[PDB]
Amino acid sequence: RNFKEGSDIEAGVSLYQIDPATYQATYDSAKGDLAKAQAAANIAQLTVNRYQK
Amino acid sequence: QTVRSSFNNINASISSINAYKQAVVSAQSSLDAMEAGYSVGTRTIVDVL
């Protein structure tokens, strides 16, 4: 729990931090793919730039 | 014969240059094709060589 029970809480405020294991892990998932996704476009743009010249 | 011998030669000779002269042009950009492709490094330098 992030809070003192009965207390006054702001909106969008973290209250209970829940195990983000499968999640932080999961978050890693798209991360590499993002890392890998961008990787492809990297070359592609790397190519396009060349072809441009 | 000799009259017709070389008179052909020169003309065919003419055709020669026109081919290679183009052909030079062929290699010419061909070189250029390389350098840019190497300049951008899309390709090796060896090719340019």
UniProtKB/Swiss-Prot annotation, chain A:
Localization per Swiss-Prot or TrEMBL: Cell inner membrane
Domain of life: Bacteria
Transmembrane portions of the chain: none
Quaternary assembly: Monomeric in solution. Homotrimeric; interacts independently with AcrB and TolC as well as AcrZ. Part of the AcrA-AcrB-TolC efflux pump.
Reported function: AcrA-AcrB-AcrZ-TolC is a drug efflux protein complex with broad substrate specificity that uses the proton motive force to export substrates. This subunit may act as an adapter protein that links AcrB and TolC stably together.
Family: Belongs to the membrane fusion protein (MFP) (TC 8.A.1) family.
Name of the molecule in the record: Multidrug efflux pump subunit AcrA
Organism from which the protein derives: Escherichia coli O157:H7
Phylogenetic placement of the source organism: Bacteria, Pseudomonadati, Pseudomonadota, Gammaproteobacteria, Enterobacterales
First and last residues shown, out of full length: 79 to 131 of 397
From Swiss-Prot, chain B:
Disulfide pairings: none
Impact reported for residue 38 to F: Partial channel opening. Increases sensitivity to vancomycin, by allowing its passive diffusion across the outer membrane
Source taxon at top rank: Bacteria
Phenotype of the disrupted gene, per the record: Cannot grow on efflux substrates novobiocin or fusidic acid.
Cell compartments where the protein resides: Cell outer membrane
Effect of substituting residue 43 to E: Partial channel opening. Increases sensitivity to vancomycin, by allowing its passive diffusion across the outer membrane
Function recorded in the entry: Outer membrane channel, which is required for the function of several efflux systems such as AcrAB-TolC, AcrEF-TolC, EmrAB-TolC and MacAB-TolC. These systems are involved in export of antibiotics and other toxic compounds from the cell. TolC is also involved in import of colicin E1 into the cells.
Family, similarity comment: Belongs to the outer membrane factor (OMF) (TC 1.B.17) family.
Domain remark text: Forms a continuous, solvent-accessible conduit: a 'channel-tunnel' over 140 Angstroms long that spans both the outer membrane and periplasmic space. The periplasmic or proximal end of the tunnel is sealed by sets of coiled helices.
Subunit note: Homotrimer. Part of tripartite efflux systems, which are composed of an inner membrane transporter, a periplasmic membrane fusion protein, and an outer membrane component, TolC. The complexes form a large protein conduit and can translocate molecules across both the inner and outer membranes. TolC interacts with the membrane fusion proteins AcrA, EmrA and MacA.
Stated name of the protein: Outer membrane protein TolC
Gene name of the encoded protein: tolC
